[PDB]
Amino acid sequence: RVFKKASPNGKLTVYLGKRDFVDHIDLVEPVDGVVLVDPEYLKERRVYVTLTCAFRYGREDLDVLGLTFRKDLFVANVQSFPPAPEDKKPLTRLQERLIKKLGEHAYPFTFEIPPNLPCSVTLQPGPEDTGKACGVDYEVKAFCAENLEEKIHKRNSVRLVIRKVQYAPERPGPQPTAETTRQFLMSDKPLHLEASLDKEIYYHGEPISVNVHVTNNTNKTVKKIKISVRQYADICLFNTAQYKCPVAMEEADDTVAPSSTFCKVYTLTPFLANNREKRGLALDGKLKHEDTNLASSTLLREGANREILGIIVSYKVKVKLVVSDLASSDVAVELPFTLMHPKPDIVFEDFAR
Structure with missing residues (x-):
């Protein structure tokens, strides 16, 4: 199975092998995906993919209305198209298989989540509790723009929320x-x-x-x-x-x-x-x-x-x-x-x- 999501306009679509990535304490399952870009539509603009881990308070997501607090914990940014040299990436089987089946307009994007970051967690206050909704989210955002310093419009970007889950082996x-x-x-x-x-x-x-x-x-x-x-x-x-x-x-x-x-x-x-x-x-x-x-x-x-x-x-x-x-x-x-x-x-x- 493979999941994918496109921006308002199908111009851009993200593909992932799974919604949950496992933390094994020593290391974390890599977030290896692929994005499908349409070179003509893009023309000038480059396609970027950012992975964000942030604690947020006031709302059930990183959205604006009522978000009273946000603390960035981890941010990773890759230029997927055109493929930036420095951001080398030894593709994963799933990525190969996907670029082949999708076309050559499909480029890989890969993130390495550090081991000591918190896992995905959320909390919704009870009826008689005065605190607000809060939690730690990992958000993958695929977008396009000439360079990172320019405005991006919601129409050409895809935001997915992935989960980092914690596993540990039974012990002696x-x-x-x-x-x-x-x-x-x-x-x-x-x-x-x-x-x-x-x-x-x-x-x-x-x-x-x-x-x-x-x-x-x-x-x-x-x-x-x-x-x-x-x-x-x-x-x-x-x-x-x-x-x-x-x-x-x-x-x-x-x-x-x-x-x-x-x-x-x-x-x-x-x-x-x-x-x-x-x-x-x-x-x-x-x-x-x-x-x-x-x-x-x-x-x-x-x-x-x-x-x-x-x-x-x-x-x-x-x-x-x-x-x-x-x-x-x-x-x-x-x-x-x-x-x-x-x-x-x-x-x-x-x-x-």
């Missing part, structure tokens, strides 16, 4: 574990809670198994157990804020009687509600789009600048025991984990998802 080592012990009033007898997850890294759609073990040497009773997954998303630019939202929950009527032991495995799956409501939830795309998932965890390299990532995302499973005197007491434990995007003769389809 002990699984996430946490425990706590509680002594209530008028007693030295302990209620001990221990839990763990089957892995440290999970992918969109994958179920999370939570092993919960309780040693109740108390005269108290555990009435119920609540297991939840929560997302934490911090806005780091312009209008600082901290959002928190449950993305999976399970309340079970399991009980743990006085001086008894209990264990059970609970399975839940963080999921973006098919019904897209504006909750202060960080996503990896517009909530409107089908392929949009919950944002992936932000990977924080040692000593890396946190602000310029724009929105920091993390997840945690929380295990809570509701105990049977004043108000019901609660014994809980939290377990961090990281959520990532899964691991990854020519048919054309629109890009607009």
